[PDB]
Amino acid sequence: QTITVNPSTTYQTIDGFGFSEAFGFGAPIASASASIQTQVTNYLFSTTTGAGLTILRNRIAAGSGSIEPNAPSGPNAQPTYTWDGNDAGQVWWSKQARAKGVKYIYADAWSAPAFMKTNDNVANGGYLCGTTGETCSSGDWRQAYANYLVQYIKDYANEGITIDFVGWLNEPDYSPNYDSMLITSGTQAASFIPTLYNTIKSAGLSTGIACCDPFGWSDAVTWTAQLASAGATQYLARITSHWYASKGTSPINTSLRVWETEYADLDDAFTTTWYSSGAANEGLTWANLIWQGVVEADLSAFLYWIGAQSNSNAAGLVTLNGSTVQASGTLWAFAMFSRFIRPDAVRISTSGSPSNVNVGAFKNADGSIVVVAINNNGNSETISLSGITASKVSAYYMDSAVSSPSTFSATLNGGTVGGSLPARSMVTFVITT
Numbered sequence: 001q002t003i004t005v006n007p008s009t010t011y012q013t014i015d016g017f018g019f020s021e022a023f024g025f026g027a028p029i030a031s032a033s034a035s036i037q038t039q040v041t042n043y044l045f046s047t048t049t050g051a052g053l054t055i056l057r058n059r060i061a062a063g064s065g066s067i068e069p070n071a072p073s074g075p076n077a078q079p080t081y082t083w084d085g086n087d088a089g090q091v092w093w094s095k096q097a098r099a100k101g102v103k104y105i106y107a108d109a110w111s112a113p114a115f116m117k118t119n120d121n122v123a124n125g126g127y128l129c130g131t132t133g134e135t136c137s138s139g140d141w142r143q144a145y146a147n148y149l150v151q152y153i154k155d156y157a158n159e160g161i162t163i164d165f166v167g168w169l170n171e172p173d174y175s176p177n178y179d180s181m182l183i184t185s186g187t188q189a190a191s192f193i194p195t196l197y198n199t200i201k202s203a204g205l206s207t208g209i210a211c212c213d214p215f216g217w218s219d220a221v222t223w224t225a226q227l228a229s230a231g232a233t234q235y236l237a238r239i240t241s242h243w244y245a246s247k248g249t250s251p252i253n254t255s256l257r258v259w260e261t262e263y264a265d266l267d268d269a270f271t272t273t274w275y276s277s278g279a280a281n282e283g284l285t286w287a288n289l290i291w292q293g294v295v296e297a298d299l300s301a302f303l304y305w306i307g308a309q310s311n312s313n314a315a316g317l318v319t320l321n322g323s324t325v326q327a328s329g330t331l332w333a334f335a336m337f338s339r340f341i342r343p344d345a346v347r348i349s350t351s352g353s354p355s356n357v358n359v360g361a362f363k364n365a366d367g368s369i370v371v372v373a374i375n376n377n378g379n380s381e382t383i384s385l386s387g388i389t390a391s392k393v394s395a396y397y398m399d400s401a402v403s404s405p406s407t408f409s410a411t412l413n414g415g416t417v418g419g420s421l422p423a424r425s426m427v428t429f430v431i432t433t
């Protein structure tokens with residue numbers, strides 16, 4: 001029952017929580033009525049009625065929708081760039097994100113253009129020409145690919161949007177039948193990173209490099225150690241991973257902030273369900289996964305796949321079905337973290353979690369202490385928070401009985417915060433000392 005919270009013991013910095021609007025999935029929303037646009041963007045970004053999300057991940061398209069859809073005559077020949085100021089809805093989405101509280105934009109390529117790769121195709125894998133052990137008859141396209149990624153960044157800068165981070169790979173351990181590009185190791189990745197870093201700096205930009213968005217955490221572990229041995233981590237700003245093939249239950253050995261940059265239930269229907277049977281698309285399942293990432297794997301960020309799309313399955317947090325906008329249970333799992341744990345928060349020490357209650361705590365830059373308690377028991381659990389002396393508490397809960405986060409009746413005795421955590425619920429305490 002007694003949880004100790006220790007703000008003098010701190011761990012990782014929190015960068016935030018977010019999602020993507022890649023592959024044109026958000027473009028019908030970008031083109032919808034002002035009323036639909038407002039409903040969708042408030043669900044994603046509002047800190048009072050939505051999920052308060054703080055990170056947007058955009059895709060850099062490789063062929064169709066690319067800024068360089070047609071090969072030049074060779075790897076050092078003058079490119080022909082295109083720019084429509086739309087980017088399949090991502091310019092609109094980026095401007096909405098900046099207007100409504102997003103702290104970081106990350107632009108991530110799923111592949112280089114086909115003419116820069118060993119397989120001369122945007123899909124079914126292939127390697128960037130000129131990386132270690134990847135010789136192409138047409139030559140070494142490393143500088144061409146760095147120049148291409150910088151032009152995309154400048155295109156966004158010309159629309160007034162500053163990209164914070166750039167990634168040059170997506171799941172490079174995976175070769176599906178759509179935009180993809182591989183690496184054999186972090187050692188091979190290290191043959192391109194210095195070229196990209198130098199090209200960004202030379203263009204007068206400060207964009208940070210993120211790598212390498214593996215399909216699973218086990219490759220993020222392997223590749224980070226290889227990048228460190230190759231001396232490439234000095235050029236990186238973030239280490240990234242997806243959680244599809246494997247999840248994190250331990251932190252990566254790095255001083256860089258680590259982002260979980262894509263994870264979702266891709267298979268199941270969209271559901272408003274918070275808890276029913278522990279299914280993969282349930283809100284409470286996702287509360288526990290975010291908890292695992294932030295508390296067990298020391299993540300600085302946790303991203304879903306798609307924020308909002310039309311006729312969504314579970315791959316999206318919010319759906320647009322005609323003119324009707326609906327929030328998933330998963331959206332409210334994100335909300336119970338993201339509304340309250342703001343960028344530049346630091347995770348802090350807790351001890352004394354009851355059985356099957358997952359606890360985390362955070363200190364915001366403004367000094368608020370956020371304690372999250374996920375009760376996975378089939379019964380209410382009474383807790384007390386010692387180690388902090390509260391002057392005030394605002395608390396919120398989410399369970400099957402409410403349709404969105406609702407005021408929670410916290411106790412406060414002699415500066416000790418407490419409460420009765422409902423069964424199969426999440427409670428967030430925002431404590432002022």
Ligand SMILES: *[C@H]1O[C@H](CO)[C@@H](O)[C@H](O)[C@@H]1O
Nearest residue numbers: 027028030031032086089
């Ligand atoms: C949203 O949809 C409109 C047409 O309905 C497009 O013109 C726009 O670029 C966006 O895709």
